[PDB]
């Protein structure tokens, strides 16, 4: 279009495929905190990816594969299938997934794993994807396309007093930074 550039980590180097990253709160918003597979709710297998309201903790690394591939370069408009590096034993897998649409999920949560045990229920169908409408410096906004119904929605933020869970807000959120996790290759 105007046209797809390459995805950056911000540290200056274009963002490459099964390259364990971090995502941080950008710029300190709102206070800023890390993610990772956070303590929210109770048992049956924790789906929801979690943000931190402490700043200590990037969380968990986050390997952005069209996923059953592997490529050089992550152009903004290009889609994938994302995923920690290490599922809580119990979930089936690290994929997320977006539960849907009742049930006092009340958004579309970020999901882990295959099933659901406890809240909302069936998971969405779709690609993911990504990238800044920005301006200065720096990095921005990730984005899923539904199978079903979905010309796609970003990825803004809910909370519910346990941290903070992702979800597909109505406008925008989250101006996102990404550090690879280390590597050679």
Same mark, same amino acid.
């Given at each position: 279009?105007?046209?797809?550039?390459?995805?950056?980590?911000?540290?200056?180097?274009?963002?490459?495929?099964?390259?364990? =990253? =971090?995502?941080?709160?950008?710029?300190? @918003?709102?206070?800023?905190? @890390?993610?990772?597979?956070?303590?929210?709710?109770?048992?049956?297998?924790?789906?929801?990816?979690?943000?931190?309201?402490?700043?200590?903790?990037?969380?968990?690394?986050?390997?952005?594969?069209?996923?059953?591939?592997?490529?050089?370069?992550?152009?903004?408009?290009?889609? +994938?299938?994302?995923?920690?590096?290490?599922?809580?034993?119990?979930? $089936?897998?690290?994929?997320?997934?977006?539960?849907?649409?009742?049930?006092?999920?009340?958004?579309?949560?970020? @999901?882990?794993?295959? %099933?659901?045990?406890?809240?909302?229920?069936?998971?969405?169908?779709?690609?993911? *994807?990504?990238?800044?409408? #920005?301006?200065?410096? @720096?990095? *921005?906004? +990730?984005?899923?396309?539904?199978? #079903? %119904? %979905?010309?796609?929605?970003?990825?803004?933020? *809910?909370?519910?007093?346990?941290?903070?869970? +992702?979800?597909?807000? $109505?406008?925008?959120?989250?101006?996102?930074?990404?550090?690879?996790?280390?590597?050679?290759?």
């Amino acid at each position: 279009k105007n046209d797809a550039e390459p995805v950056i980590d911000t540290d200056g180097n274009p963002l490459l495929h099964r390259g364990k =990253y =971090y995502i941080m709160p950008s710029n300190w @918003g709102p206070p800023g905190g @890390g993610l990772r597979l956070g303590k929210t709710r109770n048992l049956n297998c924790p789906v929801t990816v979690l943000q931190d309201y402490n700043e200590a903790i990037n969380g968990l690394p986050v390997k952005f594969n069209i996923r059953e591939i592997l490529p050089r370069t992550i152009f903004t408009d290009t889609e +994938l299938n994302i995923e920690f590096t290490e599922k809580p034993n119990c979930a $089936e897998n690290r994929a997320w997934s977006l539960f849907k649409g009742d049930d006092r999920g009340h958004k579309a949560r970020v @999901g882990i794993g295959g %099933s659901n045990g406890h809240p909302g229920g069936e998971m969405l169908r779709g690609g993911f *994807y990504g990238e800044q409408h #920005g301006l200065r410096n @720096g990095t *921005y906004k +990730l984005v899923f396309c539904r199978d #079903g %119904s %979905s010309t796609c929605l970003d990825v803004g933020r *809910y909370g519910n007093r346990e941290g903070r869970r +992702l979800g597909l807000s $109505e406008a925008g959120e989250l101006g996102v930074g990404f550090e690879k996790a280390g590597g050679g290759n």
